[PDB]
């Protein structure tokens, strides 16, 4: 039959969440950043945003086909109806999930914590970010856990602008002695129409138009046209 609108919306949200979790677990190593689900008559297009699209596709597309089939089998879409693209992020430096994955696989590669964090920070700043903050917590040195914070630029924390001016990601790193937690926050620059950042300005920012230089008429001149 059919279900209520409330249940339908909750259900498609649940589907999106599970799909994103599975795609994360599958393509974290390939710079996975997110999934977009587009429903069109008799078709469902799944766009996977990743930094390394060729690794996501695999050789001759094999990997992507596998993924499609797996989705087809899991969520019970009719055979041949679901399909999966794969695109690249516009700016990797401004995606906190991508930077968190980069830091994760840097730490998994034996790189020292401070070197990796400072490199990620500098790459984010060089990408045009207004500011960023990277926190790594856990057994960094010895048996006692500690936290380690790296900040640069401007970073807001309160109010509604935090929901569209700063992008946040939290990730786990499985090391020999235990889990390291990494948190990456990027404060996006104000972008008027062009997606490097939000279109709306910060609510407390007031810009005053510079008055043009006029010359006061000394005498009444009448111009006939």
């Amino acid at each position: 039959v059919q279900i209520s609108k409330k249940r339908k919306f909750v259900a498609d949200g649940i589907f999106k969440a599970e799909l994103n979790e599975f795609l994360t677990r599958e393509l974290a190593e390939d710079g996975y950043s997110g999934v977009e689900v587009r429903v069109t008559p008799t078709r469902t297009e799944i766009i996977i945003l990743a930094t390394r699209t060729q690794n996501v596709l695999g050789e001759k597309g094999r990997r992507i086909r596998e993924l499609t089939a797996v989705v087809q089998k899991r969520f019970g879409f009719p055979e041949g109806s679901v399909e999966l693209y794969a695109e690249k992020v516009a700016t990797r430096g401004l995606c906190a999930i991508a930077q968190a994955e980069s830091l994760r696989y840097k730490l998994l590669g034996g790189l020292a914590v401070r070197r990796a964090c400072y490199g990620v920070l500098r790459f984010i700043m060089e990408s045009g970010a207004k500011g960023c903050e990277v926190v790594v917590s856990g057994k960094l040195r010895g048996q006692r856990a500690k936290s380690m914070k790296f900040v640069d630029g401007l970073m807001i924390h309160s109010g509604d602008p935090v929901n569209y001016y700063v992008d946040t990601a939290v990730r786990h790193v499985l090391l020999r002695q235990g889990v390291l937690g990494i948190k990456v926050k990027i404060m996006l620059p104000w972008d008027p129409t062009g997606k490097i950042g939000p279109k709306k300005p910060l609510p407390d920012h007031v810009s005053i138009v510079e008055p043009k230089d006029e010359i006061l008429p000394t005498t009444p001149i009448s111009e006939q046209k």
């Binding site: 020292a112 914590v113 070197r115 400072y118 040195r141």
Partner: peptide
Amino acid sequence: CPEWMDDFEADPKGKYAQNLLKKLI
């Protein structure tokens, strides 16, 4: 080396502080 500055800044007073300071100069 930047790695020396990092390892020193992590523990400015530690088992490896003197060696890293000597390396920095």
